Design a protein around this ligand. Sequence first.
Ligand code: AC2
Ligand code: AC2
Ligand code: AC2
Lengths: 288, 288, 288
Amino acid sequence: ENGYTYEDYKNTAEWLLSHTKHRPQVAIICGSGLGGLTDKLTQAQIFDYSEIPNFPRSTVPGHAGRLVFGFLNGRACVMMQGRFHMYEGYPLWKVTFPVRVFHLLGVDTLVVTNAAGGLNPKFEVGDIMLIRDHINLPGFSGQNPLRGPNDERFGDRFPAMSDAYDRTMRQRALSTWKQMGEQRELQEGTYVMVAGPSFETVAECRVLQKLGADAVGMSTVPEVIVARHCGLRVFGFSLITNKVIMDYESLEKANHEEVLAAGKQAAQKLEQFVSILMASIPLPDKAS
Amino acid sequence: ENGYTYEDYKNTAEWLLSHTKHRPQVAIICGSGLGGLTDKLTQAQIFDYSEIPNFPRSTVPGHAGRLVFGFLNGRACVMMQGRFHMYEGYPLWKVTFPVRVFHLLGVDTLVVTNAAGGLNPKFEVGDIMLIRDHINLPGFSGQNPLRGPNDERFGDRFPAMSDAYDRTMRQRALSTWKQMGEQRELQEGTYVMVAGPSFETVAECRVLQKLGADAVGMSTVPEVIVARHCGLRVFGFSLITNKVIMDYESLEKANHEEVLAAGKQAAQKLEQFVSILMASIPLPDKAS
Amino acid sequence: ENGYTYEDYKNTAEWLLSHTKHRPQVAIICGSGLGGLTDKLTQAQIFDYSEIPNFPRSTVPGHAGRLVFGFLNGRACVMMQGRFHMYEGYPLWKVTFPVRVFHLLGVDTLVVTNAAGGLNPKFEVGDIMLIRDHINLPGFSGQNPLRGPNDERFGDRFPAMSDAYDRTMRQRALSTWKQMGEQRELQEGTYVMVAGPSFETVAECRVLQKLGADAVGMSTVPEVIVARHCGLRVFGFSLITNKVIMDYESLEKANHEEVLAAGKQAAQKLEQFVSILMASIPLPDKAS
Ligand SMILES: Nc1nc2c(ncn2COCCO)c(=O)[nH]1
Ligand SMILES: Nc1nc2c(ncn2COCCO)c(=O)[nH]1
Ligand SMILES: Nc1nc2c(ncn2COCCO)c(=O)[nH]1
């Protein structure tokens, strides 16, 4: 919200339009190591955040920071490769700028991916967790992308998140996972946002499991919130890249350097899976 | 604390004095839909935050933002209709400016009202929860109105909140509720502050119940903290305006638009109840 | 991290070097009432934060704010008497400036002390809790000293804290406590950071015990995080100065004014104990 003015979004959206023949309907934010989805697009038109009017440029990850309008599995997409994270200093109203821009672009759906740790034991590093809900930890303390005066033009002052992650798409996906006979069922769970670079400590790991979080991460939640605030049908997954050490028997890891899950075909499984799901995303056409 | 200087408070308080024949003893902050209490005052003298020297002006709610010095049930009041919330961008040292101003006005008691969600099942939308305690969620993370250098003139560096909500007034109220034979006993509980516009998700609803919160809201706590820091006898209620969905059987709501609880006579029950309680508030006179 | 530039640290470290004949290996941050350790140093050379190039000066506690390079029990130290706390308005990247400076000074170990409340019943006011882990509460919400672009020169973007408090030194201390026959075993536990001046309320006391915190405080965690980010072997204790009231049978206290624990010989027991432990701290020499 804060920082930009509606015309900032207007301006950026419009410029994007007057610069891409494409008019997307689906906005996809690729987590770490899931940027590969950008390869699944046709008629791809790449834009470096850099060259886009108000778009936050990136920090070190910048050397992996672009917005690509393509076409994914029978849907006008606009993938964002390399999202913005709070721990990079981006105030949340910047992290989520793009989600507000997309809405203005005409995007009606936002599929949000992300690599995350595993709090739930049943998760196996590599798994893919359908996000059914979220525990916005930094929001409790004020770190919410909607802080500041509300832009009625975008949405309500007190949006409900109880329904964030689309029930329809979550069912029309637990099923689709079945469809291609993916062996092990698409895990489903609650993702807990946690900001700050550092990785949880076993003590923190436990207050996260107790709170009910199935997976932990440092993003998504802010983009879901404003996507919701906008209307944007929202659904997304979480590629468990490493299991968090819930007890003092350490010497066992969960390194991001050890993102190799996302540095494997795990990321590839979630990518194809997201492409197929383009078919499950409702069209703005309808047609009975 | 921060942002203003002691003379900012001095100045504003004094101006208020040199502008109102009244010298209040009780400061009341009306929650959403409880501003009606302003109607229960006699010799009311209204001041738009706007016209008061350092008082934060409001955002959209501004079109419901004034401080009215009246007289409530045998007590010199100063009601604040439409409080400041963190999610409106007000840094906490602005949200709570008024509480510090009141103290300088001579106010010795602060009754804080607020509309909130219902985490405790025994609560019925419409209920009125006496605040016995609070879980300051944004304070854990730094969002405390006392951050910054401490003004010894106002209080201690490390105030205790263990005793925030006055035991005396809480008992001299559970009783008073009995007095007028109000049918169902005045519920009592722990209010949990949660900032950010958004409404909790079922996942968040559950970490709130587990933490021990009886009701959830986006205010009060900051004003209680500095009121305490000042001395200010503090007691207040929480008008359960909607029950929070603790489980995935949604399609059931808790809309603020659906503030109709506070958009009913519920707000009226708490208002009269607060007026009567003016009698239970100790006087600075004493007189055996 | 943020606020300063690497050359700010470079500059301050170097100035410190070109101003102290000493080259420390161990950096000690004294909690409240544990500054006394400064008396256990030989060839002590005191520096007021004030006179050091980029070092945050202090607020009221300033009248107890210096960095003393001495020699503690056969180790080149650099004690910091009176640490910086978030609740004083210091952004975390200032609270922890010194830890980053020390590393540049050549310091390889950081022993962090702190006075804290007692959530665990088995703790007796006066006890000394070896910090085995921590629950960084303000970090979940964004208040992490590493927010902002990461300085690869100092460390990784996603440091692990699972191993923060050195296992070696924690065992080579539970033992050392035995060594001098200290009667009651060196308590060990999880410290929970909580910012904001205020002291927890019974409601907050309980969400702290439930989260798994053995003791509560308003510091250490930020300095541990960046110490870790740097490499810095980290271990530290927590002098339980008062038991937190976990239930509504109050009129029982935990005043910081009632820091007399730390205002006793309790602080003295932890101080000597820290001096002896200088012997357990590995040398950069090695020598079989
Ligand atoms: N907090 C957290 N995030 C993780 C973890 N594993 C992956 N992520 C996602 O952010 C870092 C990329 O690996 C983990 O163990 N903890
Ligand atoms: N967080 C939260 N606040 C509420 C709820 N209901 C009322 N409030 C008070 O703030 C919004 C006004 O209705 C609710 O369900 N959740
Ligand atoms: N939060 C908290 N910190 C404490 C307590 N006792 C000591 N400390 C450490 O910070 C204040 C110094 O006493 C306590 O009860 N609560």
